[model samples]
Target: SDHYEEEYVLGFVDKWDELIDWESRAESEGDTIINILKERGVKKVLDVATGTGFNSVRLLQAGFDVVSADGSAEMLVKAFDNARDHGYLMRTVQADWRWMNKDIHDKFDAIVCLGNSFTHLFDEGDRRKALAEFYALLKHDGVLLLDQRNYDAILDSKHAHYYCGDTVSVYPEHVDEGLARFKYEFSDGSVYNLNMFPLRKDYTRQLLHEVGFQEINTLGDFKETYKEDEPDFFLHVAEKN
Candidate 1:
């Protein structure tokens, strides 16, 4: 709340669900994230990305106490409405992840950032600050679940990744060390673009380790192995000691 507003995501929120097609996404993910948290004994969860509160509502249904936080006001609104439609009133806040503690003070059993959300951050310092905040807000035994596009596939191809709806073609428009740009085109001519910091898989892991996360495991679409470029996202599970 104190640092940056969600200026980068202004026109994107209203069309997010259209781009995502939640039903297919839910099926695509299934119990992977939920099961991981449960297996790790997570109860209190802070969903940092909370995009449209999809996973937050799912977590609620799975019986985790959840608080959904997002930087965009419109996204928070969308999340709140989406939660309401699910028959759960979600607790949500307009929070800049870099200054999350200002809006969210409670420690969490786990923190989840999905939909390749971390890439939205541009600067190395901002990334480190956000991870530091995440480390500070977690319980001693807490875990952090964050995801990013398979930038390795891109940068190596020479940077970019996610599985959205079948009807939508999520394209990696362009990528470089400085920025990873994407184009979301709905079948109905609904097109939108988003830009993020093109973070590599190795660099992201290093950042987590440097932020004091003790054990870090990277997964390809919830699995340990995959064909090169098979997974559109990389899930990084980091534990706080």
Candidate 2:
């Protein structure tokens, strides 16, 4: 069916905010990080996996020189259109975070990969390699922040049928804390199936350390709290050595 993917995605996209509650959630998530970045007094920022430029637009409004990049040309087009709508000129790039150095290195005072954008890698090994590339692209003392699903809480919850309803929605029915692999389903006609790799906190921390990040911090949920048991996402902040 031609409408399979579109229908699946639209179902989720339609309830988007309700699905993730991003509008209200973005304040806590966005402010906690942006406020700290503002305090650091950095003048330029690069946002990787920038999506539709929601946060990037806010960064621009804060008077920083902002560049937005995404691996998806489809996604970047929306971002460019949004920036234009705001009458803001921006430097935009179409590239994946894993290849950050190939396209841009030492070019930004701070670089961020928010909204668990890095999780799309969906594999432990790729996550480490991607982090290394993100570190290599930063200047000395430059900051890198990215968000991910809070695996600790997810494990604790031992959730079954983590459903959000049809369309490209993922419902984790099977999970393993040690291996970080889980079974998920998506509804096409009768529900397509797949597996998701949900990386643990230690895996992420070790990767950051091995990549030579000088300062590392973790936040529970998007509220920027450090509670590991909270059933929400986490943002990892790593700084270059």
Using lDDT as the measure, the top candidate is 1
| Best-matching candidate per TM-score | 1
lDDT of 2: 0.66
lDDT of each: 0.81, 0.66
Q: How do the predictions measure up, each by TM-score?
A: 0.88, 0.75
RMSD of each: 3.6, 5.3
lDDT of 2 by residue, 1-241 (tens): 8366535433433344334433454554447777878877778798886776777877887788888887766566766776787778767888866677676644677888885666556666777888877777777878888777776666655543333333233345566754344333334433444334566777777788887888788776533233333646667777786
CA lDDT, candidate 2, residue 2: 39
Candidate 2 deviant stretches above 4 angstroms: 1-30, 158-171, 177-196, 222-231
Runs in model 1 with CA error above 4 Å? Answer: 1-10, 19-21, 157-165, 222-229
Tens-place lDDT digits, model 1, residues 1-241:
5223354354565566656566666776679889999999899999999877888999998999999998777778888999998799999988987799997879999999887888877888999999999899999999999998777777774221223424555677888888877886665687778788888899999999998999999998732122353666789999999
Residue 142 accuracy (lDDT) in model 1: 96
